[model samples]
Target chain A: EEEESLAILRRHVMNELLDTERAYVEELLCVLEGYAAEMDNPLMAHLISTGLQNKKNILFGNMEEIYHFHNRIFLRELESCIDCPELVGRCFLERMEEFQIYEKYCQNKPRSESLWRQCSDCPFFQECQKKLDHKLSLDSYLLKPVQRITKYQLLLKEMLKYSKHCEGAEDLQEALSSILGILKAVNDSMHLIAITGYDGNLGDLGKLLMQGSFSVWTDHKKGLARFKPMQRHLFLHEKAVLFCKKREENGEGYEKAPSYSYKQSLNMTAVGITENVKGDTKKFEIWYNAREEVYIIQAPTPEIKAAWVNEIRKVLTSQLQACR
Target chain B: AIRKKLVIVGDGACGKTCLLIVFSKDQFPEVYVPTVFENYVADIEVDGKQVELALWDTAGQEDYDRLRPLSYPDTDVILMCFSIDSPDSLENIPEKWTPEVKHFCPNVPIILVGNKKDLRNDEHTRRELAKMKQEPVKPEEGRDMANRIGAFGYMECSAKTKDGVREVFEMATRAALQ
Candidate 1:
């Protein structure tokens, strides 16, 4: 029944998107449908409420309002998962940066006296300008009255996702506060660019904004590190070792070990150390490439703990088994 | 089995279009409008292998920086041109244009050409020579720019006189083939 409802909702979206008269709303509707699919729980209720609300906002709201609505929905979806929150946040931030670059390119074109201005007069200008105007207005709205509201929404989302087994709301709150501070910095920079116009020096401003966001992401990294120790004990020792051995024999290198630090230990082998010591936790998984290679080592704390002796023993045992 | 696309980027009046004409037609034009965006195709047999070269010419205005990246999306070689008469053009090559090209197409081969060497004796030459002596013409600067961007090498040429023109193409084609 739930699947049926999702299918019906998707069909309705497809029909609206296909209708030639509604082409302007197609991108917005499609984005909303994608978010709905990603958050597939209590599907009908959430979809009906959130989807219709965003649709109405996009259809009837002013350009600025629509922009805010879009950002709000994106942030909301990002807040839904704690497993890779930093990755999602950084991706969204980069997309916004791309949009800003595009906006500047558009603005600079008409003002410049050059032979290439004819190329700028392409038909895509109208659509691009509409999108740019919408984003500018949205950014303005974010900077002013709704700043705290947006920050709180992000915080609440993180709390719900990560609170299942974590402690110290104070730490999360502190991270949220720092992120809000960075957003304020970003808001000021955006307004400055809007008023003063983009000099070629706008690249400097981009670097500044990126640094601010990086600091915020660093805090999240710290938070995730705190949970590593306990995770290591539960998943790294017995279960993950057996799992990795089986997968290695099957030639499945992509298999992920239950522990976060397994790849780190393998990396330490290059330095003539095959085991992770408690003090060597930082350098243990230095070789882990999150995308391709797979290593399964349990992390007992969010911060890596070195168990050099134990790690050395494990390496010898694993090597002997492999040799046989 | 397919040909490689090479993009040639430089400042305005830097002989980018002339270089393309020389390679593709074996002829040079006395009067040529600056190329906004155009491609010239040439077929060359190197070491018994048929290699086709698609050379793209991009508008060299600072305003056209956005279009520069698109021309070299799948480019295999880049002949970066700069007229010796215009040092500002050379300055902009490394600072403004080269970075954009490198960021988009990092592995593409680049050969820098200090064009209009014949113009060194013209009225433009007097003006440029004064500037060069004042600034002390640093061939090292051009070489450094090429090195930083992983270009094959830097060479000077006068397309009108055809001095060093063939060699420039030879070096660029050799780099692309490699």
Candidate 2:
């Protein structure tokens, strides 16, 4: 009775993993690839498709290698059967821990932000958003891989609850522990960079609201600024702003370092989203007053400027209110 | 505080840039064509409210049609203008401009503006239109067209005289709040 229930529970988890993974792949094809083809930049489209397809291929291969190749044979022979291990779940965990696919998606370009071009209402974008379940954007689609990984640990915990003394339980356990560590690393590398201290301080900084790569320009009189094109991620935290460098290409995993902190400049009186003002139309300016100095940064496009302004304003409002 | 964007569109040099310049600069300037527009920001406390007004100029040329598709949504009100001294510029509104603006921005209100108001009664400007057997467009015609196109309000302004220029934007700002 105990063995029968154990197989049933283990089977449930196995079935769910394949079903969920298959949905993930189908979404990448039907939605992500669907929009990529229509967008202006075909280079980005090609790169996105190539990386996601790699993940899809791994999923299909594992499903085939596990069920058709061995699970059937093991059930048929029972006591005489010896299943070859590390085929399905462990192999996927191992591949993901490598995290090279993430690096490939990033591509090590400092200011490669041509994605959010302009604001528009098209049927293609509306349909693309309909498929998504969270705050919709092209970058959010890439994060689905990270979101999908959480299920691996959850289902594995259930599988282990019933897989004791079952064949090769030790191998599955080993993969789970290794993947658990990798999971923490993914959090540190991808999401943690947005909200943590970067000047080598070992403490909580603040919560991350939004972060994106932007070009920076500082000096301006009345017209053009001395164009300093530094490509860095401007992380909008709850308490302050952090200018952090992009993750290095060769860096192993979970590497984040903040270059500068702007906690002292959080109490801004106003933020203006300006274009065609004292600057070029292609570059919109975000100007704010904190101390007595006016801090201004020019964003590449209106959509990018609007997003940054909205985020900065939200943070600035709270900081100002608390000071009063 | 209230935020509203006003995008102006009309045929090339049909007093579109002049109207913007008058409202933005609020002065009689020395013929500033300002190619690719130097957008002047105006902070108004009309009716006891703070408004950050941005005048988005699309140049209203065929060359700028690609950029025109998006400037509509972020806009709260549109200033559809025609030169009061040129009747042909009024015809281009229903034919060339309003249909596209309506398609791009469905819910935003529009205010019809008749620019070059100072030239409407000027003898030289009247004589030039009279050669083509046409007179300067009357304010009634501008109002009728605004009513025809379902515009919220109608305003006429002259950049040379700076007459009714401030009121043109004030009405637009009021229309945006409405």
Off by over 4 Å in 1: A1-324, B31-37, B60-62, B128-141
Candidate 1 CAPRI category: incorrect
* Candidate 2 local lDDT, A17-81, one digit each (tens): 55555555554554434454344345445333343433342222222222232233322332221
TM-score of chain B of 1: 0.82
Q: Best candidate, lDDT-wise?
A: 2
As for candidate 2, its interface RMSD to one decimal place is 23.9
lDDT of each: 0.44, 0.55
Deviating ranges (above 4 Å) for candidate 2: A1-324, B31-33, B60-64
The docking quality of candidate 1, as DockQ, is: 0.01
Fraction of native Cα-Cα interface contacts (under 8 Å, chains A and B) also present in model 2: 0.00
